[PDB]
Design a protein around this ligand. Structure first.
Ligand SMILES: O=c1[nH]c(=O)n([C@H]2C[C@H]3O[C@](c4ccccc4)(P(=O)(O)O)OC[C@H]3O2)cc1/C=C/P(=O)(O)O
Ligand SMILES: O=c1[nH]c(=O)n([C@H]2C[C@H]3O[C@](c4ccccc4)(P(=O)(O)O)OC[C@H]3O2)cc1/C=C/P(=O)(O)O
Ligand SMILES: [Mg+2]
Ligand SMILES: [Mg+2]
Lengths: 187, 192
């Protein structure tokens, strides 16, 4: 049995697009960072580099009520994870970290999964700031390094391609890339 | 380095006392289950056996807004977990399962930890319905069996004593903590 841990932001839920849409909506005069020019996991820091006071403006977007609830799915993500979890001898958990400002993040993520994937996937959510203490064969995540208290995690990190990591170990280019072969490589 | 997974309900947060106080307050006419007569971790099913309409009444108490937020800490728990996490070569995570009815559970548990233990322990919350896929040396929990997808969890399960599990008598091969004043330091030591 292969256990796949699947991150939420940038893999199932389109955080980058939602952040940019929310930023342009609420700060329509301000410069922004086009998705194709995003570099580095931390959007706030790139905004800071664009101009210092844009850091807090972009944070105010992802800290706001509704932000996580309203993210659009990543193309192909929902179908893939449904297909994946229906494969025999395969178990999917949605493994996601909340913001340190957790107030509008934690309940909204449970509600996002419930609406987009249903109650069966709500049962498969793992919230943690340290993915290295979760046991599995693979972790699909859009962050360059995934670090924590296990120096050698049980899972192999598959980097899932997102606008901010496109320009940087196995990679999945999209959910249309061949994720079945990666799972097979663990059977 | 020893990693200790610490459950919330019945170990840090007094769920049983909160449930009974909330039931007596809202359903004062109805029969209840005294804490010392609790048996089995599913309170709702014992109420159901007492009388069928009590099952939904008691659920309404722990499904209500505020319920998890307002629970009192277990005596000694907060001091113990702070001491435990300050020990060298020791890491504590708070490893808790939300209700399937998660709406007033999930945020409230985060806020409970933030208020009673601070932001440093908020960072150490793991929410999961399957504790068996979480890696650690020990899991301290008040539930008789802890089951899930790993047939052989990495951790050893230490049963923490609560009104509903007190009647169980463990085989010599398993370990119990009677309270936070019992010798949890030795259990951790056994893993060093
Ligand atoms: O500080 C930040 N700056 C920033 O630009 N972001 C963007 C990037 C993305 O990061 C994450 C994120 C999760 C955990 C820790 C940091 C960031 P994800 O891994 O879920 O994509 O969720 C918050 C999102 O916010 C987050 C954070 C989050 C900080 P933290 O969560 O408090 O550590
Ligand atoms: O059916 C139940 N009946 C019941 O009496 N309870 C009580 C007992 C205890 O159950 C727990 C519980 C949480 C997760 C899985 C089972 C039980 P905990 O052991 O964490 O305290 O959640 C809070 C408490 O609520 C929960 C449930 C939980 C149902 P679900 O599986 O979350 O739908
Ligand atoms: Mg991510
Ligand atoms: Mg418990």
């Amino acid at each position: 049995s292969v256990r796949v841990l699947v991150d939420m932001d940038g893999v199932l839920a389109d955080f980058e697009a939602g952040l940019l849409r929310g930023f342009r909506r609420r700060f329509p005069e301000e410069p922004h960072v086009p998705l194709e020019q995003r570099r580095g996991f931390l959007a706030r820091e790139q905004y800071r580099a664009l101009r210092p006071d844009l850091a807090d403006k972009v944070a105010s977007v992802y800290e706001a009520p509704g932000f996580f609830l309203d993210l659009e799915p990543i193309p192909g993500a929902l179908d893939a994870v449904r297909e994946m979890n229906d494969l025999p001898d395969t178990q999917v958990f949605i493994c996601t970290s909340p913001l340190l400002k957790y107030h509008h993040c934690v309940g909204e993520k449970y509600r996002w999964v419930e609406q987009h994937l249903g109650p069966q996937f709500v049962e498969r959510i793992i919230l943690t700031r340290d993915k290295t203490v979760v046991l599995g064969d693979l972790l699909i995540d859009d962050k360059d390094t995934v670090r924590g208290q296990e120096e050698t995690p049980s899972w192999e990190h598959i980097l899932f391609t997102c606008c901010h990591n496109r320009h940087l170990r196995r990679r999945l280019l999209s959910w249309s890339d061949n994720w079945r072969e990666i799972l097979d490589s663990k059977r």
